[PDB]
Amino acid sequence: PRSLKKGPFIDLHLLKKVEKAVESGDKKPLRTWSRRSTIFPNMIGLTIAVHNGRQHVPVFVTDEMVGHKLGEFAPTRTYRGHA
Amino acid sequence: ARIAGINIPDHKHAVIALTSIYGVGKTRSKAILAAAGIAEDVKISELSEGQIDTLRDEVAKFVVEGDLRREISMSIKRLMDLGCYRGLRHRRGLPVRGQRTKTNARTRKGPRKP
Amino acid sequence: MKKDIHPKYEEITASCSCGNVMKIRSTVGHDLNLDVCSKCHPFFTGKQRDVATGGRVDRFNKRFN
Amino acid sequence: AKLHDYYKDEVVKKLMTEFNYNSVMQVPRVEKITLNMGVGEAIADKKLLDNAAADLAAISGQKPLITKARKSVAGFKIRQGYPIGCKVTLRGERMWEFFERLITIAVPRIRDFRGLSAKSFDGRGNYSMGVREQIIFPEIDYDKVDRVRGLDITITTTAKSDEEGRALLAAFDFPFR
RNA sequence: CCAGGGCUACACACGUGCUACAAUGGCGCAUACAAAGAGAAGCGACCUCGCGAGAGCAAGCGGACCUCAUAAAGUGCGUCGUAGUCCGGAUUGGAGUCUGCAACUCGACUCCAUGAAGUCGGAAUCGCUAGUAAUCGUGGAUCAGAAUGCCACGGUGAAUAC
RNA sequence: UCCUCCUAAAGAGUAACGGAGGAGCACGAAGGUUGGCUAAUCCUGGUCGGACAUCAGGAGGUUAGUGCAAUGGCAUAAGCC
């Protein structure tokens, strides 16, 4: 948990990407490599292609996802089972 | 001899009997007895009913037994249908706080069958 | 009723701790002192209080300006 | 006692005013109330059923009848004529006083109570609820307690529908989530 | 050269440790006695603020001067009466603090709640001859943050050698 | 050797190394009388309890039951208490 007198974290490029995707009105999935950024209430409903080191997985922002970070919806380890 | 959900034991002291409630531990019972005014080294056999109904409202001050199991269960449920990392670890049955999954975690992944 | 085989079933006065008094024919063997009543229960009054079930954008704003 | 006279004024007058009854005999009457304790684990020892019978005798006012098995089942290791359950059928004024203690006293004490869902009517207005542990009735000492030992109470009303019996039980202030 | 991931995965097996299963103990109050170290993009008094981790304000010190830094077992008075219990403290939900571009993968700590296995451990096997074993605390290197490890320092302190 | 069904041709009876099943008992109650009662199997509802135990209601009407094989019977019960 970040300290409260720091504010939440979002990258400059992701936040300006979010603003230009809102101002442009277009709602395709856009990609970022920034898993460390907090989701925000202006980003609801749009798709974020989040990097998991290999791929860009599409994340659909919900009401329930708001305060969290972006990496929690892109699992970077693939495990099915041993036996 | 009975608070919001359950029976508290009667021969035990006030804070020790008060921890038998779900949602009330040690500091909660210290604050409950401090707000009530009863000295904690009395027994529920020693104590009458007016003190324990002023205890009843003061433990209604806190989210306790039934709706607390409701809150914890719903919070795990919201994480589990959310599909995040901690929810998915709650789903497979593994540690969620970054413990070592290599050797240990028989509390989480259960007693060692195979 | 079959005369002697039944347990005793007497008029007592129950002492409702919400403030109320009730004559009740019962089996307890004393004047029972119950804790909560059909009156002033949270489900009966309307204080059942199911929580918000989703306050994330509320929580983010009460955290941060 | 209480709920009988409250019935004889308010419940008949309200089911008169909101259901078309040209006669007062059409209004549903809660006729009997049976407490069943399907003990069942007395295939090993019948000390347990013998304790459960006295538990029901402490809950109600009647001495309960022990129910022997109807057909032999090898799925549950029972024999024909083995006493496997216990029941009280209580009707009349004693049923009215049991209904008093059930509503005014007992159903607040079901320990995280959320309201009994009304869809447990079977098709003709007879209700059935399941009380999970025996200490919800204050006749039990709780200094003596041995097992959890719940029961189920089924109420037989003379209603023919589910909505008429539901309005009848709701006229006596049932919780009904 | 860069960003992101991984080195932290987990049907399992083994090694080395730490915490325990309590009453020679647990909790609450008051209180006694150390040694060895480290410190300038550092150590950071006093006071104020918060339950606390901490913050604000900020003197002193390149040090037998100031700071880290209250030693803890012990002692005195209470309470617990042998229960998985006021033992145990894993797990998990919530709310935080600090370092850092950044704490999701994957840090440390604090609070509130929860209260898992465990009731002295199979076949086997290890260390130790005296200020030793056992037990209790403190300190340093690495280091922005991150020791139950490693290296050091003291306190109490045996039994047994035919 | 004995019993039940078919062969057996609508009275009885009727053979085969013809087709199928049982008996060599049980019970002082499982006999007598009086009084009372009525199934199987599904559906719904309900603590554990779940296809199947106990409860409550509905459907159905004897598909049940008979101490024991089969046939004939049985509600006025020959069935259950």
Beta-carbon neighbour count of residue B63 at 10 Å? Answer: 13
The CA distance from D66 to D52, in Å, is: 10
Considering its fold, how many domains does chain D have in total? 1
- How far B6 CA lies from chain D's nearest CA (Å)? 7
Q: How was this structure determined?
A: cryo-EM
Structure tokens belonging to residue A64: 């329930």
Structure tokens belonging to residue D176: 């009904």
The CA distance from D172 to D30, in Å, is: 11
What is the residue range of D22's domain? 1-177
The CA distance from C54 to C49, in Å, is: 14
Contact A41 C59 (CB under 8 A): no
Q: What are phi and psi of B43, to 5 degrees?
A: -100, 165
End-to-end Cα spacing for chain B: 47
List the CATH number of the domain containing D137.
3.30.1440.10
Residue type, A22: V
Strand partners for D151: D131
Chain C residues 29-58 within an 8 A CB cutoff of chain B: 33, 35, 49, 51, 53-54
**D17 and chain B: CB distance < 8 Å anywhere?**
no
Q: How many residues are there in chain C?
A: 65
Strand partners for C14: C22
Strand partners for C11: C25
Compute, in degrees rounded to 10, the torsion defined by CA atoms B47, B49, B54, B58: 80
Element (H, E) at C59: helix C56-63
Strand partners for D65: D87
Residue of A72, D94, D14, A49 lying closest to B85 (CA atoms): A72
- How far C59 CA lies from chain A's nearest CA (Å)? 8
**Do the strands A47-51 and A30-32 form a parallel or antiparallel pair, or are they unpaired?**
parallel
Q: Strand order of the sheet with strand D30-37?
A: D65-68, D83-91, D30-37, D149-157, D127-133
The CA distance from D116 to D174, in Å, is: 8
